[PDB]
Symmetry: D2
Subunit: 261 residues, 4 copies
């Protein structure tokens, strides 16, 4: 769909499953060269790779833990070494577990901050460092959430990490705009990914989540991948520093429908 | 580029010049049926029509002042009568004149509020009324500005009209999300349109505006039309109630570059 | 409580009832000279005046419709003529009626925009015009609502008027900051005023509103008057251009409690 | 000034200098019992203590590094042990150093995140844990910055830490509102503290910072301490989850004065 994406090299962290996987497939379909990333063992990665071959795409899988500085540095270098360059960096890896705020251990807090925020910082730093030293007008896309705006009891660490990601992205966008480097956030609402297959499997929970979505339905991963592909393209040439929410209207205060209150 | 736009009927207010004109041309290129609108000078509208014929597009021009209720109602009806339906409504007409706030007459304030805000409300009302009565999952795009967020001394009426447009759009998006109707705002930064040809003609003013744009250049109308086309397409199916800023980074506080302060 | 308020002249539009009345009483208690405003007949105004005498305060009541330019001009002049000066201008008058957006008449829309937004603009203009011509570091306080942020189906005109008031206030604050004039908004959540005595009288509606308030209770008018008095004082000397929400947590997305979704 | 503060126990991190010191003094003047905190240099803490004795206040100083969990836990316990209770927790400690984002080491990033964000989280956690277990309607005030909103090139770690603090505070405010616990942020603009005595000493830098402040002057610490005292009092009983900016208008985009652009 986007002619300018043909031949671009795209790196996506945590792309062996969920949204990361869908984006990897979408970019392959746009004929871009993709670098898939997995954490423990090359296995879930192979499923994505076969999906990419199925569409005639070209890609490789690189192991790396985004909380380990050398792994992130190596990930970026692997792209340049294998395909000769880097055009788009997508920081997507993330995690979260519920815990009452006053009972949350420092350990749980750090794990989420390190993965969701610091991991994205490291990825952004390495990509931009490369763009600057080689005068490339590349782009960085950071995966955020409606929760960089909507507070989230039981997930104070996750909300904080995304609120922080917002200011990080806006700062990087301003700092490097003069060099043509664009930095944007994507803010997904409730999406139908494997990690949510169980909660949404239960009809009482599913209906509960749907009641918080004005459009009335849980989004599909492809609806997010479409956003990432557009933001990466030249069609979005004058867009930088924003957070594009794709949430079915979730950030518009669902509890106020019907002029209630 | 967007296959789903073929055959869609798009109405654009104030489209005989500037951004409105560029969007009319872009939608014609996507093979959508376009309804151009002119307030007074018909000759200008015909020029746009020739541009559309040049690309093989189909379109008509309808006279109408967005501050006259019957004109707006007639505009929407003209689309349905000529093409049999309506799919996308774009409220783009607008105006502004500088005046110190404490010296602004009620007359100047009303003229801007009526055109920029009320005009958009009337257009949104008529389009949505049609969508609801005929069960159509249409979409409304309202042309805003970085000034629905950035204050604007000397243009207090314009800033107010856009701040109001923001809440109007978010309200409509929430109110009609259950019916599949999407409502979004586009927020252009400094764009190179005829209305700005003189201010930007002067090298000292041009350089002044550019210093407020992190990316360093004044955007082209086509860069905005690209945003409108994407928002109207099914690729943005899960997006509603947002304001998509296309401003080269203007809303990121340009005066804070280089960690100044 | 605030020594600097003694002797200050405070004008409050729509202050014969509700929040306006509570603020008039609070300022009288701070020993400021107050100018009460009523629309139709001096009658409800007398109730407020007696309340002010009861606390040893000094005040007068002036008739005026905020949608009539000459009435607003006269209101400001009446303060200067009676007390010799003007220190604080509070635009509080407002109204709203529910109607489905696609069915709202232009008439209803205009009535709300004229009263809620234009009325506040006229009041701000006259006060600031006076402050500038006489080199007074006065202050303007505009009464907004959580709805300058939270969308409101059935009340699209009200939401728009407040979203507009937000940008108007921020613009005026920036435009006149160099002259020491402060302009701020107060954003009340659900407050217990006479105008809401019936809706809140019904136990099923009351409980419904309370479920949208994290703190669990509908606020009292005095809790808002406390905010206005602080903002007017020198304790808030470095505060300008903001919206101070006093809503029991309403703007924090109440539907997301208990990590729901 | 605030009668309800008499006898309240207030803990302030990093209060041996700057804003923390001014707040400690202001609260002592309101006759509250204060717990000063110093990281290393004890001599500095004693200076603050003398200032408090000078006003007839009661206070103690406790050593503690906010990046050490046991130190924060001990700090809260020291207050309860010495004064028998805790009413207000103020997380104020912080730091920052300029570095180009693509050249920032993981070490510098972590130091700022740990101190500015995690430190505040630990402090908030311990205070709230106490409030909940003893059914106390206490309050937490987190010291933020205009930079939880304004991007900051060269200080990407600081901006991220404050953007994160914003969502942390809003989440905690929503999560604990049912129990009467209030959580708010204060967002200072450019303030005249010792840490800034040199940059502001140089007339060319001072004038540079002042050009970014609409009101035209760098604020004094007392103007911030006034905000903290009000937020802690019962006058702000219906206020929670907000960020109160005290910045002379800095967040209103100073580069847009005079309708420029
Ligand atoms: N799914 C949703 O509804 C939703 C809503 C908002 C935001 N998001 C965000 O989108 C991203 C994708 O979420 P998702 O639904 O696909 O979840 P997911 O768990 O399926 O995907 C996250 C991936 O991150 C990987 N990962 C985790 N920690 C890692 C580490 N240290 N190093 C390397 N890889 C690591 C995981 O193995 C996993 O494949 C996340 O950042 C999430 O916060 C998702
Ligand atoms: N050009 C920019 O840099 C910029 C930046 C932000 C926002 N915008 C917004 O984008 C829109 C397009 O601006 P533009 O640069 O093309 O300006 P423009 O003046 O060239 O286009 C506005 C059009 O509105 C028409 N119009 C005005 N009042 C009308 C009325 N009552 N009835 C019908 N038509 C009417 C005018 O004839 C004109 O063709 C406006 O709404 C403007 O507020 C523009
Ligand atoms: N009460 C709440 O819960 C709440 C919540 C958010 C915002 N507000 C805002 O606070 C303000 C006070 O509301 P309130 O509850 O006291 O309502 P209210 O109706 O009791 O007070 C509004 C006053 O405005 C006066 N008024 C209306 N139109 C006028 C006109 N044209 N000229 C002069 N006076 C006019 C009315 O006579 C009335 O006394 C309003 O601006 C409202 O939008 C109130
Ligand atoms: N001064 C300003 O203009 C300004 C503007 C915005 C925000 N702020 C914020 O206000 C707060 C006060 O700033 P300030 O100007 O007084 O700066 P400051 O450096 O004078 O005060 C910060 C204090 O934190 C202490 N501290 C640092 N790390 C610590 C640790 N690990 N454990 C314990 N104490 C530690 C320092 O010793 C110092 O006394 C900071 O959080 C800052 O981010 C200040």
């Amino acid at each position: 769909m986007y002619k300018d994406l043909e031949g671009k090299v795209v790196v996506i962290t945590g792309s062996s499953t969920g949204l990361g996987k869908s984006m990897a497939i979408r970019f392959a379909t746009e004929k871009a060269k993709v670098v898939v990333n997995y954490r423990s063992k090359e296995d879930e990665a192979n499923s994505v790779l076969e999906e990419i071959k199925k569409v005639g795409g070209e890609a490789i899988a690189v192991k790396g833990d985004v909380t380990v500085e050398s792994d992130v540095i190596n990930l970026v270098q692997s792209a340049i070494k294998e395909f000769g360059k880097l055009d788009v960096m997508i920081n997507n890896a993330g995690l979260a577990n519920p815990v009452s705020s006053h009972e949350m251990s420092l350990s749980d807090w750090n794990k989420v901050i390190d993965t969701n925020l610091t991991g994205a910082f490291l990825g952004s730093r390495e990509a931009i460092k490369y763009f600057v030293e080689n005068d490339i007008k590349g782009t960085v896309i950071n995966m955020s959430s409606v929760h960089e705006k909507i507070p989230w009891p039981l997930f104070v660490h996750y909300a904080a990490s995304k609120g922080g990601m917002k200011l990080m992205t806006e700062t990087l966008a301003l700092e490097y705009a003069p060099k043509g480097i664009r930095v944007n956030n994507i803010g997904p609402g409730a999406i139908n990914t494997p990690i949510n297959a169980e909660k949404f499997a239960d009809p009482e929970q599913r209906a509960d989540v749907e009641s918080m979505i004005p459009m009335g339905y849980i989004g599909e991963p492809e609806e997010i991948a479409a956003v990432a592909a557009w933001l990466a393209s030249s069609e979005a040439s004058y867009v930088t520093g924003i957070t594009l929410f794709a949430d079915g209207g979730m950030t518009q205060y669902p509890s106020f429908q019907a002029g209630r209150g």
